[PDB]
Amino acid sequence: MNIFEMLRIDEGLRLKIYKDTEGYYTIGIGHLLTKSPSLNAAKSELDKAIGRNTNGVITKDEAEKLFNQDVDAAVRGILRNAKLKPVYDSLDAVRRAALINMVFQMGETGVAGFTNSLRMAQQKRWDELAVNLAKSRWYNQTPNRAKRVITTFRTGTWDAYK
Ligand SMILES: [Cl-]
Ligand SMILES: [Cl-]
């Protein structure tokens, strides 16, 4: 188990433009295209992202390329963030995967805001972190995925994914 396999399970793979759980136009492996209510705008972004006239449909290979770029950006976003970097540095490999997953899903800025949980994570207070993470919109909107990430963070093992 690794971050790639972990996110591929959490996000699935879709080759045609679709709406995410928030209702945003997405594609591939959780690749958000735009928050705008327009499919054309989505198609525009899609074509610009892929570099060809796609017509709202891509290949597996294209989905995987977007996915590689997105995981990479998530990591780099973490390392560049003053609030996140130190948390990350202090964690074991499994738990880093948990943090990366949250970032990929909610953006750096979003996670950077979980002030209290970041502190608990840093103090390695696992059970408390788990409780605190659960009191969030994130958990209430996507509970199964959230439970998976939380267990990973709490336990430091890949059990929730096995
Ligand atoms: Cl892009
Ligand atoms: Cl869910």
List the helices and strands and how they pair.
Elements lengths: L2 H9 L2 E6 L5 E4 L2 E4 L4 H12 L9 H21 L3 H6 L3 H14 L1 H5 L2 H8 L3 H9 L2 H5 L1 H13 L7
Antiparallel strand pairs: 1-2, 2-3
Helix pairs in contact: 3-5, 5-10, 7-8, 8-10
This protein binds chloride ion (2 copies).
Describe the protein in words:
The chain has one domain: Lysozyme (Orthogonal Bundle), CATH 1.10.530.40. The longest helix has 21 residues, at 60-80. The protein has helices at 3-11, 39-50, 60-80, 84-89, 93-106, 108-112, 115-122, 126-134, 137-141, 143-155, and strands at 14-19, 25-28, 31-34. A three-stranded antiparallel beta sheet has the order 1-2-3. Helix 7 packs antiparallel against helix 8 and helix 8 runs antiparallel to helix 10. It is mainly α and 162 residues long. A hairpin with a 2-residue loop joins strand 2 (25-28) and strand 3 (31-34). The structure holds chloride ion (2 copies).
